Amino acid sequence: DSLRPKLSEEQQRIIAILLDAHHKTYDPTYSDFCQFRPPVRVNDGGSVTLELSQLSMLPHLADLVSYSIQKVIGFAKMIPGFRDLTSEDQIVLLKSSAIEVIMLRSNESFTMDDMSWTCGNQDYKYRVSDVTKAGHSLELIEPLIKFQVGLKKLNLHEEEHVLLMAICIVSPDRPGVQDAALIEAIQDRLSNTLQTYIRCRHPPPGSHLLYAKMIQKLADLRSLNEEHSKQYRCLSFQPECSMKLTPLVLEVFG
Ligand SMILES: C[C@H](CCCC(C)(C)O)[C@H]1CC[C@@H]2/C(=C\C=C3C[C@@H](O)C[C@H](O)C3)CCC[C@@]21C
């Protein structure tokens, strides 16, 4: 059997639209980052109390996340079909997917040279110790780095990378969606574009089985999101935490 259908004119269009959507909303130069409140890295050596006391990298990482949520919304608006949903569902989907899409999309600055996100030079190079200094614990960070490496190693084409983001976002099992059929319809259209792409275009050899691995990463993103939730709740109990966040971050993770 081994059937290999040609991508349809429409599928191609979808891929074009998504590549362009991404390039419009992902500055590979990180040129805006000098506009965020400053990275502050005063050493905890090995401490939760200090890290909560200071939260030194929270202003900087929360501006980075607030900014990225903005670009995500932007990206989501150009996904073919997104606009056909009601704004009520559009927002439900943006809200519940934001943290996951940031994680996926942060794969583009992630480097296996030293397991960091290099945005970068020194000041915009983010390591595990920076994430701890923004008040997160190892139970989110370590599965996150593992997630970044797993994803890197999939060596996705940009096409697969932007399809995966679109699919993560337009998900019919988000708690609180109204019109699940429509969202599924939009997702199936992307998944099918992705499944076909992989068979049409992906080396590697012998596998259309990369599709399976991609879906596994979506499941992974679910767990990281739950863990992020619980660590965000905790963060939010630090007095004056709200000042170190932004309106958009509070509303999206509230
Ligand atoms: C868990 C957190 C986020 C949540 C932090 C709060 C809100 C306090 O809970 C991490 C996810 C990955 C991210 C990192 C980079 C991300 C990039 C850099 C660029 O790729 C451009 C992307 O759009 C975005 C590394 C540092 C840690 C992070 C911020």
From Swiss-Prot:
State where calcitriol binds: 26, 68, 105, 109, 136, 228
Origin species, per record, is Homo sapiens
The task this protein performs is described as: Nuclear receptor for calcitriol, the active form of vitamin D3 which mediates the action of this vitamin on cells. Enters the nucleus upon vitamin D3 binding where it forms heterodimers with the retinoid X receptor/RXR. The VDR-RXR heterodimers bind to specific response elements on DNA and activate the transcription of vitamin D3-responsive target genes. Plays a central role in calcium homeostasis. Also functions as a receptor for the secondary bile acid lithocholic acid (LCA) and its metabolites.
Listed GO molecular functions?
A: bile acid nuclear receptor activity; calcitriol binding; DNA binding; DNA-binding transcription factor activity, RNA polymerase II-specific; lithocholic acid binding; nuclear receptor activity; nuclear retinoid X receptor binding; nuclear steroid receptor activity
Where is the protein found, in the record's own terms? Nucleus; Cytoplasm
Q: Which GO terms describe its biological process?
A: apoptotic process involved in mammary gland involution; calcium ion transport; cell differentiation; cell morphogenesis; decidualization; intestinal absorption; intracellular calcium ion homeostasis; intracellular receptor signaling pathway
Where does the motif 9aaTAD lie?
247-254
Interaction with coactivator LXXLL motif: region residues: 77-95
Q: Does the keyword Cell cycle apply?
A: no
What does the subunit comment say? Homodimer in the absence of bound vitamin D3. Heterodimer with RXRA after vitamin D3 binding. Interacts with MED1, NCOA1, NCOA2, NCOA3 and NCOA6 coactivators, leading to a strong increase of transcription of target genes. Interacts with the corepressor NCOR1. Interacts with SNW1. Interacts with IRX4, the interaction does not affect its transactivation activity. Interacts with CRY1. Interacts with CRY2 in a ligand-dependent manner.
The UniProt record lists the NR LBD domain at: 10-254
Q: Which disease is it linked to?
A: Rickets vitamin D-dependent 2A: A disorder of vitamin D metabolism resulting in severe rickets, hypocalcemia and secondary hyperparathyroidism. Most patients have total alopecia in addition to rickets.
Annotated keywords: Cytoplasm, Disease variant, DNA-binding, Metal-binding, Nucleus, Receptor, Transcription, Transcription regulation, Ubl conjugation, Zinc, Zinc-finger
Its family?
Belongs to the nuclear hormone receptor family. NR1 subfamily.
Q: What is known of its domains?
A: Composed of three domains: a modulating N-terminal domain, a DNA-binding domain and a C-terminal ligand-binding domain. The 9aaTAD motif is a transactivation domain present in a large number of yeast and animal transcription factors.
Range within the parent protein = 118 to 423 of 427
**Which protein are we looking at?**
Vitamin D3 receptor
Q: Name one GO cellular component term.
A: receptor complex
Mod. after translation: Ubiquitinated by UBR5, leading to its degradation: UBR5 specifically recognizes and binds ligand-bound VDR when it is not associated with coactivators (NCOAs). In presence of NCOAs, the UBR5-degron is not accessible, preventing its ubiquitination and degradation.
